[PDB]
């Protein structure tokens, strides 16, 4: 499988500094069910979006269903299934801090996992139960589709 | 310039890119966007300039000093606070503070 | 083409046994004092010597 | 994996520069074929001047200098003669080369105006362009000066020198709107419209285009007398097939070799 | 009972390897198997690499003594 | 005025540097570790007071350096009480062995005794509290090193017990010499130079740290030792190198 | 001193235009329509006619012999 | 004084190859092909038309000094597809389309004059 995260979200908020770069800016999404926060770093000139829309993200490790756990590597010469076919904007980082609400005693109860899709950065913020798929150090998806709903 | 987050580029240019590189591997890492078109970023390509496995930590020029105090210390909204992991570029804009 | 310079033993001098001054005069370059400085910083004792006496004016 | 089905279309035909469009081809191709429109373009010209007896104001180089810019005609003439580093044979063979001559002595009390109508070629085809309007000026003689000598001319490119440079400017253009943001304007509204835009005068710049390549080239290849622009597009397009074909050959040797 | 550093200074390695290429261009034995090279610099380097160089080197002391060192003996920086 | 200025900068500053350079040409390192002139006559016994080569020395921060003695306490003591920190940060068959045994409770109070000494050490000899202080390797940039080779992983329990951590800084203490000889007089003088250098070590790498922020593991912290020596003698200064032309 | 043969920057004739010019000028025109009327029209050829200095008649006026 | 001579950017010296393959090492099926006195005219059309290829991985080439006259072209095919096969097949295709460009630019200009 290698789904580490899997839920429904909408766009609330875009750049609310005012936007920095011009083919980039903040989306600072909510969940529906999980209820956790979302940073994500969309190009926003190829992939539009605007406020109200919902999109269906799923941070996978792996884009094939068996979950081969590839390399990482472009090869576009290959002909196995992917699960980027039902995806209109996949991206691929490196999640690089796990940081959360630890104690000298009692564990976490929320984590916030910082992801850098090479410059395009994500914290996923939320509860301490989902994110167990999150180690630091480790090669991660997005895989977000726009629902029409 | 090249290390802004706004910065992508097509496979052309890309390859054209690699080949003024000295200790390429001979391997062509992951695009950062796979969907609706195959486009690199340039901290991704400049993470393999980066020899071996450095780990480092610089400001930007222009990086508000009320930034680190207050929220979005990590994941910074000016694209600052260069972080190096594994010699990859992971944040921030390269400036004569890192180089 | 009017600067560009360089030098193989060339002719030395009638006084002091040392290579010309100029290009015209078809000279070598001084190794002023601030070099020696620079060598002897360097530690490079052999390139130093070399340059003062080897390609400067040998003499038994 | 093949090429393209590129498509030609003329817009204005005269005997001095031509505008025409290439559609459905690559950037690179197009920026090829300008390169060799510039520099690998074989055409006759001045290089080997022999001065007797100059009595000019100028420099002895000087003449040879204007000499070699004077364009000639070569419409029919090129695609004959051989290359004389080429040639099988010693001197300017007139199988490979033009001889010119040029005899002037201001002696009337007015000033000289040795144009290159002077030069009195050997061959009728490859003359200066005076046939049909000033003529070039070489130098100004006035009385008791001469300026005696004869020069031979041979076929090279632009790559060597420029005197083989037959386009005076390629203007070389793609997407007029700026659709594929290759340029980016900070103020859009502050640019002027191309000749050939086709967007409308309130809009200032069409709309981004993700999934777009570069088509429609257009072309305005500017001659200067020598060549005919046609003849100019001609020759460059059978030379860089040329090229294409020789480095294949050298290919398939270095593979069978191996 | 040496007392100085057991470290090869970048002074000595210089002029070691020097010292060896320049008994090597005068036609002197080889330390190791050559794999096809000629500059003698280059089959200097790789002795001093193999720890094969025959030289000792005498480090005077301030007071006047002195300690003799094998290349082979002590640690090379570089 | 501001080509005049550079004008006679431009005369004046040669004959500074020449006078400068002219009055220690010959002070050079010589192989007894020592920095003396052409007349041998002793400047220095150690190049810099120290025996180092300018050129491996990077800015770094004392830690132990102007804190609040409660927060002091907090952040070096390694409490050995709160068994529920302990299985948080050390793993299971560490707890009961630090809990139990009395010499490791010992041994970490005495660790603690000599942080503090330090700290008065430091503050007596750094006033005004400033931090930023050159030493020869940078101890936090090779503990990250460490962890982004090794994979620590900074959230699970580790395996390093903590006497591990104190044995290890001793020997490395012991290993680190810049004045050879077991005089007394040899070992104060080698007590004295790599002095500043071990008060930072041990702030460093103590045994809350090491458990806290940090987590490596018995290898990580083995590579980290090894490189740490290695570095510290790559870091010495080479006998014979003219440090009198450098200076100037 | 003379007007040259080629433009430095496009490459077309401009040598044989300086007499041309020199006629439209005196006639009646000015520069800024004599310089359309010859042909030119890249602002790179037309320094050519606007920058050129004739000084081939001061040359000329140092005659050798009568 | 030492100015290169202008011929010695487009002819060949004695002993000079035209064209070398030369097989890397870091990755399978992969050969840089040097040209000697060529500049971005030849290199550019052949990298466009190799990216147009599916099968080729990866293709670019380079010109390691200015003033030298030369330029290295790097490609890399799939595991069953050699890259000469895939240089052989650009420089053919690439030639039948200036060919064909070539031809309707010649019916064209015969038509538009006087038609
Ligand atoms: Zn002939
Ligand atoms: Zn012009």
């Known amino acids: 499988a290698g789904i580490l995260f899997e839920d429904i979200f909408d766009v609330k908020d875009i750049d609310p500094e005012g936007k920095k770069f011009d083919r980039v800016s903040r989306l600072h999404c909510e969940s529906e069910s999980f209820k956790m926060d979302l940073i994500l770093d969309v190009n926003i000139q190829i992939y539009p979006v605007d406020l109200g829309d919902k999109f269906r993200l799923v941070i996978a490790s792996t884009l094939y269903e068996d979950g081969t756990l590839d390399d990482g590597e472009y090869n576009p010469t290959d002909d196995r299934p992917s699960r980027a076919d039902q995806f209109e904007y996949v991206m691929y980082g490196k999640v690089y801090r796990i940081e959360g609400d630890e104690t000298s005693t009692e564990a976490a109860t929320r984590l916030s996992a910082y992801v850098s899709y090479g410059g395009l950065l994500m914290r996923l913020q939320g509860d301490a139960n989902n994110l167990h798929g999150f180690e630091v150090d480790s090669r991660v998806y997005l895989l977000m589709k726009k629902l029409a709903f | 310039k090249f290390t802004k987050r706004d910065v992508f580029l097509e496979r052309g240019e890309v390859m054209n890119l690699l080949m003024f590189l000295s200790t390429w591997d001979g391997k062509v890492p992951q695009p950062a966007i796979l969907k609706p078109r195959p486009l690199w970023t340039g901290k991704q390509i400049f993470s393999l300039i980066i020899p071996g496995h450095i780990n480092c930590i610089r400001t930007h020029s222009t990086h508000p000093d009320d930034e680190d105090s207050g929220p979005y210390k990590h994941i910074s909204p000016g694209d600052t606070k260069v972080v190096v992991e594994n010699g990859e570029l992971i944040m921030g804009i390269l400036c004569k503070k890192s180089l | 083409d009017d600067k560009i310079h360089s030098r193989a033993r060339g002719p030395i001098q009638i006084l002091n046994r040392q290579p010309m001054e100029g290009r015209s005069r078809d000279g070598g370059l001084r190794f002023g004092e601030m070099e020696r400085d620079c060598q002897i910083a360097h530690g490079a004792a052999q390139f130093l010597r070399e340059r003062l006496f080897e390609a400067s004016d040998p003499y038994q | 994996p093949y090429a393209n089905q590129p498509t030609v279309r003329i817009t204005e035909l005269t005997d001095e520069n031509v505008k025409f469009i290439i559609e459905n081809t690559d950037l690179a191709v197009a920026n090829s074929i300008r390169r060799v429109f510039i520099a690998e373009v074989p055409i006759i010209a001045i290089d080997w001047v022999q001065i007797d007896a100059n009595s000019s104001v100028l420099h002895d180089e000087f003449i040879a200098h204007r000499l070699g810019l004077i364009p000639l005609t070569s419409d029919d003439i090129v695609d004959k003669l051989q290359y004389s580093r080429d040639c099988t044979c010693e001197e300017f063979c007139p199988e490979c080369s033009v001889e010119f001559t040029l005899d002037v002595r201001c002696n009337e009390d007015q000033t000289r105006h040795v144009t290159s109508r002077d030069l009195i070629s050997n061959s009728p085809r490859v003359i200066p362009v005076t046939s049909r309007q000033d003529d070039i000026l070489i130098v100004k003689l006035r009385k008791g000066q001469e300026l005696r000598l004869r020069a031979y001319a041979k076929k090279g490119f632009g790559k060597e020198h420029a005197k083989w440079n037959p386009t005076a400017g390629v203007a070389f253009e793609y997407d007029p709107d700026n659709a594929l943001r290759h340029t980016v304007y900070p103020k859009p509204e502050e640019w002027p419209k191309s000749e050939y835009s086709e967007l409308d005068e309130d809009e200032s710049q069409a709309p981004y285009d993700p999934n777009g390549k570069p088509e429609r080239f257009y072309y305005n290849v500017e001659s200067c007398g020598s060549l005919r622009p046609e003849t100019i597009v001609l020759s460059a397009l059978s030379g860089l097939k040329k090229k294409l074909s020789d480095l294949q050959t050298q290919l398939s040797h270095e593979i069978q070799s191996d | 009972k040496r007392i100085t550093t057991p470290y090869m200074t970048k002074y000595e390695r210089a002029r070691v390897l020097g010292t060896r290429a320049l008994q090597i261009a005068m036609c002197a034995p080889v330390m190791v198997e050559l794999e096809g090279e000629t500059d003698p610099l280059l089959i200097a380097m790789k002795e001093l690499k193999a720890r094969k160089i025959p030289i000792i080197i005498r480090r005077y002391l301030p007071d006047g003594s002195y300690e003799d060192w094998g290349v082979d003996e002590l640690i090379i920086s570089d | 005025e501001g080509l005049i200025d550079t004008a006679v900068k431009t005369a004046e500053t040669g004959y500074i540097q020449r006078r400068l350079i002219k009055s220690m040409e010959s002070v050079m390192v010589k192989y007894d570790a020592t920095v003396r002139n052409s007349i041998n006559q002793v400047v220095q016994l150690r190049y810099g007071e120290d025996g180092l080569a300018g050129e491996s020395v990077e800015f770094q ?188 | 001193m003379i007007i040259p043969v080629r433009c430095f920057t496009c490459g077309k004739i401009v040598g044989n235009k300086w007499e041309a010019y020199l006629g439209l000028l005196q006639a009646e025109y000015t520069e800024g329509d004599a310089l359309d009327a010859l042909g030119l029209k890249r602002y790179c050829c037309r320094r050519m006619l606007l920058a050129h200095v004739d000084l081939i008649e001061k040359l000329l006026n140092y005659a050798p012999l009568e | 004084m030492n100015a290169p001579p202008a011929f010695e950017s487009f002819l060949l010296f004695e002993g000079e190859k035209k064209i070398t393959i030369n097989k890397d090492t870091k990755v399978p099926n992969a050969c840089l092909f040097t040209i000697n006195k060529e500049d971005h005219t030849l290199g550019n059309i052949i990298k466009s038309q190799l990216l147009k290829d599916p099968q080729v991985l990866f293709a670019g080439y380079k010109v390691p000094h200015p003033l030298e006259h030369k330029i290295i072209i790097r490609v890399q095919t799939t595991p069953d597809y050699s890259p000469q096969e895939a240089f052989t097949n650009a420089i053919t295709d690439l030639i039948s389309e200036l060919s064909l460009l070539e031809e309707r630019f010649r019916v064209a200009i015969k038509d538009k004059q006087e038609g």
């Open chain 6, 61 to 248: 921060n004392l830690a132990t350096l102007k804190p609040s003695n409660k927060a002091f306490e907090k952040k070096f003591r390694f409490d050995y009480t709160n068994e529920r920190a302990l299985r948080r940060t050390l793993q299971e068959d560490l707890v009961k062995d630090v809990l139990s045994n009395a010499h490791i409770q010992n041994e970490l109070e005495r660790e603690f005794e000599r942080m503090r000494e330090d700290r008065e050490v430091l503050r007596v000899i750094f006033p005004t509290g400033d931090s930023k202080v050159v030493l020869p390797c940078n101890l936090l940039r090779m503990i990250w090193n460490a962890q982004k080779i090794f994979h620590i992983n900074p959230r699970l329990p580790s395996d390093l017990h903590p006497i591990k951590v104190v044995e290890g800084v001793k020997e490395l203490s012991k290993k680190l010499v810049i004045v050879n000889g077991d005089d007394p007089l040899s070992r104060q003088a080698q007590e004295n130079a790599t002095l500043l250098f071990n008060i930072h070590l041990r702030s460093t790498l103590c045994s809350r740290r090491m458990a806290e922020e940090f987590r490596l593991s018995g290898e990580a912290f083995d590579w980290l030792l090894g490189e740490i020596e290695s570095k510290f003698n790559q870091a010495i200064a080479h006998p014979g190198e003219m440090v009198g032309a450098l200076a100037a």
